[PDB]
Write a protein that binds this ligand. Structure first.
Ligand SMILES: [Ca+2]
Ligand code: NA
Length: 196
């Protein structure tokens, strides 16, 4: 695929991507050291910190997945492959639009995507296999998120596709394929879920 395909970049601290920047790995795989083991422990660093307005593309995140990507809003994450999700794959930490486009995630013991601030969260052209949950809004929070799942294929989902404890949140899906999943959506009311 890209010119860095077959190279492995070993890091020992979070890669910070600045507002208005695009980090383009060109197919590089990233392996983090001393930042986490990819377990469910809470004491782990993100591989990437995407400030507001920062973008990320064309990276493979190898094990250990540590705490994945931290997004501070208005970010695009294109063609990112998590080969072995760590504590979680991506976390929305501050408000704005975040779009995951292309790529894949496998082997998430619990959540893939964690939403900890009001946001518009899009997952597009994306495959995930062997996961607990694809999207979680932070537990017991009642701020509003709006999730879009568009051309998403999921295989082996232990808990559900998406969970939220917020009655004002919404999920919209279009061309969603799901195999071997306990239950699709855990929201206060199933009327919060829509197709388009
Ligand atoms: Ca894992
Ligand atoms: Na996390």
């Amino acid at each position: 695929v890209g010119t860095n395909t077959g190279g492995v970049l070993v890091i020992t601290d979070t890669i910070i991507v600045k507002s208005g920047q695009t980090y383009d790995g060109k197919g590089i795989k990233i392996i983090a050291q001393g930042m986490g083991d990819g377990s469910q422990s809470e004491n782990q660093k993100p591989i990437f910190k995407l400030e507001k307005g920062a973008n990320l593309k064309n990276v493979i995140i190898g094990a250990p997945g540590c705490d994945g990507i931290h997004c501070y809003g208005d970010n695009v994450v294109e063609n990112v492959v998590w080969e072995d999700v760590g504590e979680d794959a991506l976390t929305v930490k501050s408000e704005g639009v975040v779009e995951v486009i292309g790529g894949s995630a496998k082997e998430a013991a619990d959540k893939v995507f964690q939403l900890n601030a009001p946001c518009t969260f899009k997952v597009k052209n994306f495959t995930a296999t062997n996961i607990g949950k694809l999207v979680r809004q932070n537990g017991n929070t009642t701020f509003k998120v709006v999730i879009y799942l568009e051309d998403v294929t999921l295989n082996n989902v232990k808990s559900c596709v998406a969970k939220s404890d917020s009655p004002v949140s919404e999920l919209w899906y279009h061309n969603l394929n799901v195999n071997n999943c306990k239950t699709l959506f855990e929201f206060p009311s199933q009327s919060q879920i829509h197709q388009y």
